[PDB]
């Protein structure tokens, strides 16, 4: 088509997309239609002459919508990794219409500047800033896997220069075999991957009761490993674990890493966004010790998933995505972004409130952010049983996890549209099905 | 923001995009801005309260628009890695709203691959409509698709020699594996070889830059006689350098009787086989094991579009199939064929201006959409020309080396290149040519 054809249909699509996102409350979260349903609803060959815009859209409703998940719904109570906000859409449209540094000066320079905005919001210490401070600085990365690996490698080269200056006899090959990296037991798998690819030994540190790495567990490991003749050169401290909202004590672990020449990489994951809010910055005291810091701004700052921000204490050791950041940050503002996260933590506690009040359910981990780790008091069996009925119903979606030897339900409030109305309706549904589940147990 | 806000600014953005696209002739193809122009124009911190959409777009015009390469420009006469049409834009808006990475994903894929298969008049072997084993999938890029092929081949050959000799270890077999491609073949092949950890050898092309039966078999014998093991082989229709075509009918029977996986890469020109005039160049696919090309290049799908069929599926992220569906229904087979033919035509228009002129020469046969031309004389003269051109900033070309000869390429692959753009450009070449000829005299 030509341009002013596109003015019309584009403006129509805006409308279709608007309505979907308004009435999405009514859609069923999981597709209630079976593999193979689609072939016989559509012509076996392409049309010769163009179909109308009018007829295509209707097919979108009638043929496409039934066969789609609709993750964007308030009742999808898990993290939706490819979610996008409205500003992110607006940007996407433009980012598409445009399509190295020398290729795109703006794309590159915007990245550096947005990194600084992000920086300040989180109030990282000043060394981290790209603001021509000439020390530290940050970068966007494809994944939080990339990021962990980058710091790992940087960590490894560093230790080999320092150990080989020490004794010019030792080979790089001899050193590498002794290298050990650490992470909590609730470490993201992206740590294992990193260490695997970087060719070193990865060991878990036992988490404390609240699933935080607590130094005594770290120090022992250190002692056990320095004494078997291994070498510790790197470690991931996770803030906001993906299992639950667990936070590694940075204030105890940091000081140790400094003293033992262990590179400190802080994986804040998703939770990191929450440090734009003062109530949470205390979970981030200790960053002073870290050598790198990485988080995904997608879940709470509404930015494109494509983007994983990472900073470093020294720059020497180390798609048009900055445009969306720019839009989203500009269109919500820090306060809006703040109000956004805050609105979710409050629904998250609201839900916790509901679970405490019922004596058949327990809470497993202190509820700090959006997610609530709960379960039905009794066997893992009972609970496996219960998750099954919820998904079988196709009214809400929940994912589980295991803490220790315990099966857990994760209720996570991340969607842009969620209200306490939905949380209420979600609880009660869970409530009812738990009654039916409970009957069955006794048989 | 909220829904109804999207409504207002969603529409304004529609407009903004229209204008840009309408007034794209006015832009300069490559941004001309100094290192570090942006920062001073952006504030030091994020705003505390929301800015205005008015102020945001204004800043796109002022701050962003000078610092971007305008790839859509009809004057950007190189291959643009993103072909963006208007229906493609519309599916993006919907894929936006129904996040994807669901029975409708997998199924609309299978069906559009059958659609595209039927348009390319592929053997039924490669279609799943018949209920045959053959079927198609959509990949990220050709470089991925080529890798997915190679691996599938390495697996196959491994499971096959180990079936005949259980004492043989994967390790020992890999050491001897050999894959091949034309000496015009896209790097995406060398890269795949490094990841796949097999040896890669190049087959010498002919007068027309085509891989032929003689050279290929020469190579295999050489390498079999070394005790190496051929397993994979890449045939290229529409090469990167000059748009040449490996001889598929010659080469396909060889691979079969040599028990070699035949992957047929047509990344660029694959789209034109939906025209009956060009389908012959795809003859021999019958012999292939996997065929691949990029429609996002020339059929007006958005960039993350790749397509690859295999005869055997058991040999083998985004909602890409909704963008194809949209494009196809909005253009219809006719309209697409038309789009392809228009390019070819202005390609041939440019060819005959250059022949019309006695100071130039054509280097390779002008099959479809790319023209490889040259100022008569020394490479040196020709490097000057591209240096004017590229300096001028009026139009932009990417050259290449065909064997020894320096060659200027001229791609017509833009949604809105018209007959006029081709003449305004050729005038601008001749001007600069006469100059470079004047400096040759001194
Ligand atoms: Cl989180």
UniProtKB/Swiss-Prot annotation, chain A:
GO terms for molecular function: 5-hydroxy-L-tryptophan decarboxylase activity; aromatic-L-amino-acid decarboxylase activity; enzyme binding; L-dopa decarboxylase activity; pyridoxal phosphate binding. The modification N6-(pyridoxal phosphate)lysine is found at residue 299. Substrate binds at residues 82, 188. Keywords: Acetylation, Catecholamine biosynthesis, Decarboxylase, Disease variant, Lyase, Pyridoxal phosphate, Repeat. Pathway: Catecholamine biosynthesis; dopamine biosynthesis; dopamine from L-tyrosine: step 2/2. PROSITE patterns: DDC_GAD_HDC_YDC. GO terms for biological process: amino acid metabolic process; carboxylic acid metabolic process; catecholamine metabolic process; dopamine biosynthetic process; gene expression; kidney development; response to toxic substance; serotonin biosynthetic process. The modification N-acetylmethionine is found at residue 1. Belongs to the group II decarboxylase family. Homodimer. It is linked to Aromatic L-amino-acid decarboxylase deficiency: An inborn error in neurotransmitter metabolism that leads to combined serotonin and catecholamine deficiency. It causes developmental and psychomotor delay, poor feeding, lethargy, ptosis, intermittent hypothermia, gastrointestinal disturbances. The onset is early in infancy and inheritance is autosomal recessive. This is Aromatic-L-amino-acid decarboxylase. The gene is DDC.
